[PDB]
């Protein structure tokens, strides 16, 4: 019986449209929580923009974090997981978007930069996702830091151009205006190998829940993989059951449908 419950945030959790967790959402993680699920978040995003789970975090219904798709895991105030990109690939990064003149993102384990802000990061990650403004560095001072993710404002065309000088790395996207770039392994998957671990919970006993095409490994490597109903057919295809669109109480019809609760 499933255990632990991953959840993806944007687009799984909090809704594109009210930038807010549907209230069924809510009622459906107090009642798993009750039952005594383990929940965990499982994103693309640092914790340091994680700016829309208040509801579920005051409610002290999360169980642990996946954050940086893979690359920085923590329960409690326990880091259990992190990575680092190897140097090589950040500064390759870095030099293809400043010569393109594309933002990027750079985060390291307690801090984040924006190398670069353009309309891109306005239209996307502030207008559209309302993340907080994340403070400008320069692209030279990014290239020499520790780096766990960075997150670059490319297209999937740009993506193919600086791909052999990123020969390591995991490209995550979900999105066509930009991509999660982890070092070798670190995607959600990976979180929920951690996770477990810590938990003594077996893989048999899992359950993902996801949107995008970020979450298509975790979707696939959980015992159920659940897809929200406006994903694209690649994440439907990657998950065991599609359920209704985020916004038509997606997460709960689904954790109902399986017995959670
Ligand atoms: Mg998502």
């Not at 990650?125 to 290239?143: G, K, R």
């Amino acid at each position: 019986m499933t255990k632990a419950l991953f959840f993806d945030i944007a687009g799984t959790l909090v809704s594109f449209e009210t930038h807010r967790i549907p209230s069924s959402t809510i009622e459906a993680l107090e009642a798993a929580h009750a039952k005594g699920l383990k929940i965990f978040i499982a994103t693309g995003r640092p914790k340091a923009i994680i700016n829309n789970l208040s509801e579920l975090q005051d409610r002290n219904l999360i169980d642990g974090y996946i954050t940086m798709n893979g690359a920085y895991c923590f329960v409690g105030e326990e880091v259990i997981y992190k990575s680092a990109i190897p140097q090589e690939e950040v500064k390759a990064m870095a030099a293809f978007c400043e010569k393109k003149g594309v933002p990027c993102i750079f985060v390291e384990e307690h801090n984040i930069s924006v190398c670069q802000p353009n309309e891109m990061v306005k239209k996307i990650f502030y207008d559209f996702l309302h993340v907080n403004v994340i403070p400008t560095v320069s692209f030279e001072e990014a290239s020499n830091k520790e780096v766990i993710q960075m997150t670059p404002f490319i297209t999937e065309e740009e993506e193919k151009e600086v791909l052999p000088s990123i020969p390591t790395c995991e490209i995550g996207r979900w999105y066509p205006a930009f991509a999660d770039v982890t070092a070798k392994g670190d995607t959600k998957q990976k979180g929920i190998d951690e996770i477990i671990r810590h938990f003594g919970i077996k893989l048999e006993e899992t359950m993902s829940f996801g949107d995008g095409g970020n979450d298509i490994s975790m979707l696939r490597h959980a015992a159920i993989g659940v897809a929200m109903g406006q994903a694209k057919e690649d994440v439907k295809a990657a998950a065991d059951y599609v359920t209704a669109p985020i916004d038509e109480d997606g997460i709960s019809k689904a954790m109902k449908h399986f017995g959670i609760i």
